[PDB]
């Protein structure tokens, strides 16, 4: 629950689709910080990103948000090929219950 | 030997727009321009809010503007929330980095 400019949230949401994994990862981290529920569905799509640090960052953000919608996608990410992504998912699930 | 410039680099305020310049970079390569800080031994946190990807020209140079923060909520490589970074005490710099890891040495910024 943070009073954030909605135009800023839309921007970080568009950034999850950028060419630079750096931009996508940054956007995912920033969305968790903001803690808005509108970022839930676009962040769920990012849990399937080609970059291991984007997927984990999106998983940390989703846990920070605390939305139940992310439960099914986070359980899927718990079976992710990458160790950091699996650790992120485990933590995010614990930040919900 | 790629280099980096930050104009201005000293006496900054929270919200100051700085000119981030890279020279001697690899042509056509993307570089993430971000405010970083060494918050602990081997720990680097980035400001996820103000950052841009600039692509180097044929001459190996790139230029962008950056909004610097005195205080920011810091993140690690994997999207882990570190916590609040205060640049009055923490060693804050601006960095240009390619997908590899390379690029110039970060330019120290003081408030």
């Amino acid at each position: 629950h943070h009073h954030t400019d909605p135009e800023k949230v839309e921007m970080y949401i568009k950034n999850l689709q950028d060419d630079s994994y750096f931009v996508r990862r940054a956007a995912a981290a920033a969305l968790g910080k903001i803690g808005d529920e509108r970022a839930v569905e676009p962040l769920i799509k990012a849990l399937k990103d080609e970059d291991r640090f984007v997927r984990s960052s999106a998983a940390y953000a989703l846990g920070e948000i605390g939305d139940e919608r992310a439960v099914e996608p986070l359980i899927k990410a718990l079976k992710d090929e990458d160790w950091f992504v699996r650790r992120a998912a485990a933590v995010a699930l614990g930040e919900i219950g | 030997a790629p280099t980096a410039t930050v104009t201005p680099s000293s006496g900054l305020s929270d919200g100051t727009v700085v000119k981030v310049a890279g020279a001697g970079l690899q042509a056509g390569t993307a570089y993430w321009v971000a405010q970083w800080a060494r918050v602990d031994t081997g720990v680097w946190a980035y400001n996820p809010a103000d950052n841009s990807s600039v692509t180097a020209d044929a001459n190996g140079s790139a230029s962008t503007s950056l909004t610097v923060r005195r205080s920011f909520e810091g993140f690690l490589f994997d999207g882990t929330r570190w916590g609040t970074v205060d640049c009055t005490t923490a060693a804050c710099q601006v960095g240009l980095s390619d997908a590899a890891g390379n690029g110039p040495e970060g330019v120290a910024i003081s408030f």
Side-chain angles (χ1 to χ4, degrees), chain A residues 2-17 26-28 30-43 65, chain B residues 49:
Chain A
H2 313 70
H3 179 260
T4 304
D5 181 352
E7 287 269 283
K8 248 187 210 185
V9 180
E10 173 170 64
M11 170 190 61
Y12 297 134
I13 285 173
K14 188 183 250 88
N15 282 346
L16 290 165
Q17 284 245 108
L31 290 165
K33 180 198 176 306
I34 280 153
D36 229 280
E37 296 185 45
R38 58 172 140 251
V40 170
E41 293 310 331
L43 277 170
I65 293 167

Side-chain angles (χ1 to χ4, degrees), chain B residues 6-46:
Chain B
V6 180
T7 304
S9 37
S10 215
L12 313 171
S13 322
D14 188 272
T16 305
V17 169
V18 298
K19 215 166 188 184
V20 185
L25 313 157
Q26 286 206 99
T29 297
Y31 297 88
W32 190 59
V33 171
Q35 192 187 329
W36 283 92
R38 185 183 143 89
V39 294
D40 198 10
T41 307
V43 189
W44 289 83
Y46 62 93

